């Protein structure tokens, strides 16, 4: 998948699949959750395992696995509902809303298995303020699904699995989105 | 701080606790000494260390400890700090070893903590006797699949320590004659508030859940109870009984199912004598003095790990029964993360709240008057036949004055010998 | 510490200050109690929140609280922390609210912070009297506009704590009788620094303005005589140049600085302060009001410092004018102030600069272990000076700062108001 | 921005993603002279006060057109500025502070005027200075390039930085975004 | 970069930048015999000591050429820091610490051989180790390209890391750059 | 503390180290009064100022200052705090100044720290006399090229503090009559632990080198015999191996092995030093001259240590090589220092690792509750050895680093050097 280095790729799907994370960077900044959740497939699978810390020998345990407990491991019902508590004016953690950045980098495609998918690594900064002085900083890779649409965000987001850069969380909840 | 200060900051006669004792550094020292350094704090599961060398790491207040299967099945409980110079045992959080070398000057143990070599002994340590200069040790008991440890000699066994609280936990723990097992993986997440203030709305505070805390929560998944103080001890729990809407909202309609009808849920029933207690308590809170919590029926189990008394880390994970079904299994692990997690629609709301009652501390006026625990004051019954212990309404602070007042106890007591004369007779 | 102790850190006779009096821990504690806990604070301007339900939040020392005004047109200043279990009533800056609700348990308050419903009252709560459970109270003042706050009963009012800094103040407020107004927005930033460092310079230092501090501030704003006064008694100082203009045209550029001093604004103002020397030659005003109301009249940034340990402040700082000022003047205040007195502004950057690199050498044992010189001006007074009340200076002295800190041991070794009227 | 922008050619996107790496570069090389001659005589280079708001108050979230700011400056302003920060007596920044500038999420849409666009880009600023001291900041910056017959191609006509900050998390501003 | 690049075609931009993230990719993913493979056999790897100048001193800013470095190795220097961290007895990293490396601001300019490129390109480097540690570095990295018939393209032959820090804010720097 | 209570913290007879010599805050500020105020302390080395205004900061614990070349050749040290309210008086690391002057006033001072002018001094200043509002001066002293500054004039002179240990510093500073110089260049890192494990590992422990730290470190460059030194009395000590280059060849590699054994530099060494052994048989050394100056003789990486509080210390590291050596030879010690032991050195980089998490361990009740065991070579000592003074063990061995911790209570526990010099035999 990105086990040998990607093929490269037109300049064209390039700058379509950048522009389709830094539109979703904005919808996620500022706070159009209606919109970012309209970009979730209806097979969405948004995946964030738990991270732990190995020695060598036993690294392949270092991630959560499919039937283990995560951070996030969630399909659209599972969504739909967080869309509902995050647009609500009784949502404590988000309201008033937290301030996050996305800068979003390292964009590497490679074509999926199906037309129209193509598998997608890339990294980010997420920077979140909020309150008066609360600063959490994250970083990590995401590695997604996109789906090519007719929507004018034109891709939607089949599956995520977000790559966290901690073990422990440091940061008193994760009420945003990756 | 004299012990007859200390007592002044709790009064369960009149409902009165003083905030000062989530944020004095001279009270949270003592803590560590007097509370975390003799009570049973929960270890985790058996099942998330079966086999023979399995190990994970965990906390004791801030000392850090391995919980390890030997060969013959034991767990044992041991500080990872080498003796030599200090340095941590082992790093990783978590596999199997056949042993531990210190990385530092290569002191070597077994896996149950006991030092068996030490490079150039022959020349440079003639006399040492190893036997008496490994780790310390922790007493280590289990209930019914949750391994708990405590460091002193001459504390109750862990039975006694929980007393008639058994009968609270075994909802979640003895539902079936199978047990209870871990889904494996553990959350890990750092909270800024007092232990506390955690311990207590897991042992005591349906309120805030039947108010406004969980408004939002509640809207992403779409009266009557009783709530639970320990005679002694500071362990407590509450829950609604007959009203699914706090459970389905929380869970989803197949875990609410599987949890009050067909066999599954009458076997609990026949097991915990009582239809009652087996298919119509909805939503439960529980905390075993001083930090271990947990929600049956939701199953998610939590250690509180202190971090200075400005400070904690939440480590979670999630129990079912080791014969529900995999779907079931598989439901308990998407509700519970999607719900009572970092990043969970509940439990999200829950920590906002905490960090900014800790914020306002640093206030000098913050901390100058008392806060209200005057809730259900004198509505008790002590004679309850269903239910043993001080039994309120599910709105009520008893149990969290019970646990403040076990806090008193504890802090004010040199040693269990003076700890067991507050006892009632 | 003993009070005995705490007096021989500041000695205005020889003109000395032992610099533990800004790193101590327990001095701290014991400063949010008897300075803190005590002392008229600016809250901000009555034209912040002008309508019923508007409110914003603020600080009285790590106290955090509301600022709410009134259906009947009082200011209320609470504290903004729920007695159930402590949470913050209000988590947002500023708005309008016609009640706060409690996120945690519900209970719920009208905007004067009364708690007028919990939850579950008639069952759980039989015997209870919310009129006594809501959150304390601050006392609220206004002088010309500015709000202040002050918890304890027994300090004197507003008025009597100001005193005859009240003359000095009003070169800022007094101006017109339309009053003045706040421009909306409140800048707030973090200097790792001792709050002393800020309440002090703003008091008495026009030196570090008049020598190396702003040299760079100074050219960015291009192509000797004056006074300083010290409270008689309250630790309230402030200082200006008297009729030349290089300062202020510097900071706030020609058209600022000929609205401050010539045509009808000014002329007026010379009226209403019965001297044409103070409505239009004062030039460029330095002013704190003890603790940490600090201000320029005539560049006009106000700011509270707010205390975050031994180690640290906030300064919330926002800009005063004249309410019947032509718009392009407003206008030109609000560019130049930010532009000037403010975190990313020409002459404040550098002062921030400064006070962080003092506060880290005070880590090590010996920057601790030896009196910082206070001596400048020492004997060089006049409290009797037909023109200026209180005690007063040449512009550049040290008289208002040993002052301040002379109120401030005063403040520390008085166990209540009796006590500190007692050393009037 | 209000709707996802049309595509655009990879030179465009390339040039102007160029023009933000070599203005990074000058600002952390601290080549501000060429820095601030990227400025055009109409620029406005403002940097709003960000509060926390409820969801119902969320629009007075930023200081508006007539309100403090951060930063509100016009050519004259930063002019002086510049004049302020190349000056061997500027003490916030001599010594110098370390400044990295790096930039992503470059969005670009034509402008109403011909050789006009408007850019949305976010950033990381890592200013560190003296021993240890560190401030991190993020945010966007929403500006209007214009084309010029410069090596650099165009002019930064008007800049709005959006600070993920409410209380400013630095004890100074004494840098450029 | 004295002064600004001159266009690149954009399939030049894009592979550079795809080096870049491969490479990325391999140190973060812990992948350290293909990132080492990727040096060439007269690799310079170089991370000059920074220090606190004033203004007219700031030529003095790193270290130079015979003056003690963060790093400052050749081919050999390199194989040897493979070795070790490919062991199962290195601590730094055993148990293995998580790094990303967010890369941004790509310049590139022709170098005086075909076959080579002069490379800036700025970075943070994102480090967590054990339970709680976190390390946050920026800098700039200039690179020297070499084209090669390999998989990745390139080969590298010089790099010199300037880091935005004066005293390093770690306790180690057991990762690579 | 009182004095007979910090004393039971430590117990050369038996071995125990109490761990809250590290940990506690209050035992700290009384390191920074007692042992950081009155000892000699590394500033760095001559060469590294050569000319009249060349100047570098330093600390002296948690004081900066600033050490500075004057026009006739001597070196003053002086706090980098101006007297007026305090502003740090130059903010760079180093270079050439002509003067200084504080940015907040503008009271301005020569290079040696002197006063000299007050911005309105005849109207503001009447009575001032500058030459007596300076900032503290310390006493500078060297030896061999070593710059060390000490605050206190009861002080012994620099010459007698290092004493006995002089012999063991010769090993790397007295080879040639060309001296050392610095090459250019100082590193400087942060290592969140207490400086008491630093300053020992450098005294006395050749133990974790041998043993298990630097397997990696050994193996990317690619010993029985040897003796320690512990000073009769200062708290200093040195280590080295004897015949066998198998820990210098990993480390340096065989440019420098070669350098240091055979030839006429190595040759010369040992004439000077009036042994073979001294200058030829000697592989690896490591060295503390207390509190806090470090050096391993042959690699040549010298730094000094400073506290950061209790729980932190930074790093500041460089290089010496004999002034006379080959260009090329300089370039070798320059490469391979920065190689092995350096923040991210070969070596260097798991030393960091460990110190941390000994620290992060005694953030823990138990974990402090308990001695550490330093008993490792009691009694084997020979005070009577004809060929290197001292109270000299095998190479393995903590009594070196028992003398450390003696020194460090006798320090401690005097409340000036009066009686810090009566506690000499
Ligand atoms: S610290 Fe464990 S062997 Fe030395
Ligand atoms: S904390 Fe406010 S209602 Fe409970
Ligand atoms: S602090 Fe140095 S002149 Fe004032
Ligand atoms: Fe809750
Ligand atoms: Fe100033
Ligand atoms: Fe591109
Ligand atoms: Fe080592």
Known sequence: AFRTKPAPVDPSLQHEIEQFYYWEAKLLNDRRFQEWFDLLAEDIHYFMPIRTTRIMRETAQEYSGAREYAHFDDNAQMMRGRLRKITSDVSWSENPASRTRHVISNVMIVDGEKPGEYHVSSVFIVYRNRLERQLDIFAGERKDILRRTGSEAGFELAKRTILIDQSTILSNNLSFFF | WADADIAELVDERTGRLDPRIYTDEALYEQELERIFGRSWLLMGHETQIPKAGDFMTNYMGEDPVMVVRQKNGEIRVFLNQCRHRGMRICRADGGNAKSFTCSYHGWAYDTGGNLVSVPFEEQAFPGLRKEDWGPLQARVETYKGLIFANWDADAPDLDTYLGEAKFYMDHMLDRTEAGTEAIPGIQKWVIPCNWKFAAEQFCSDMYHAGTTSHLSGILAGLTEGIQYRATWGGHGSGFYIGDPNLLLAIMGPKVTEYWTQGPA?????????????????????????????????????????????????????????????????????????????????????????????????????????????????????????????????????????????????????????????????
Not at chain 2, 274 to 285: I, P, V
Not at chain 2, 335 to 343: H, Y
Not at chain 2, 352 to 376: C, D, T, Y
Not at chain 2, 408 to 413: C, D, G, L, P, Y
């Open chain 2, 265 to 425: 849920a009458e076997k609990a029933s026949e097991r915990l004598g009582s239809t009652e207690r087996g298919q119509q308590l909805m939503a439960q809170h529980m905390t075993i003095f001083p930090t271990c919590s947990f929600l049956p029926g939701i199953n998610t189990i939590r250690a509180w790990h202190p971090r200075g008394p400005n400070e904690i880390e939440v480590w979670a994970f999630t129990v079912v029964d080791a014969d529900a079904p995999e779907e079931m299994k598989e439901e308990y692990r998407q509700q519970t993360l999607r719900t009572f997690s970092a990043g969970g629609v509940f439990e999200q709301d829950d920590g906002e709240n905490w960090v900014e009652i800790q914020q306002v501390l640093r206030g000098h006026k913050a901390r100058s008057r008392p806060f209200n625990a005057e809730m259900g004051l004198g509505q008790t019954d002590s004679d309850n036949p269903d239910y043993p212990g001080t039994i309120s309404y599910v709105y009520s602070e008893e149990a969290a004055r019970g646990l403040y007042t076990q806090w008193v106890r504890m802090m004010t007591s040199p040693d269990w010998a003076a700890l067991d004369a507050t006892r009632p007779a």
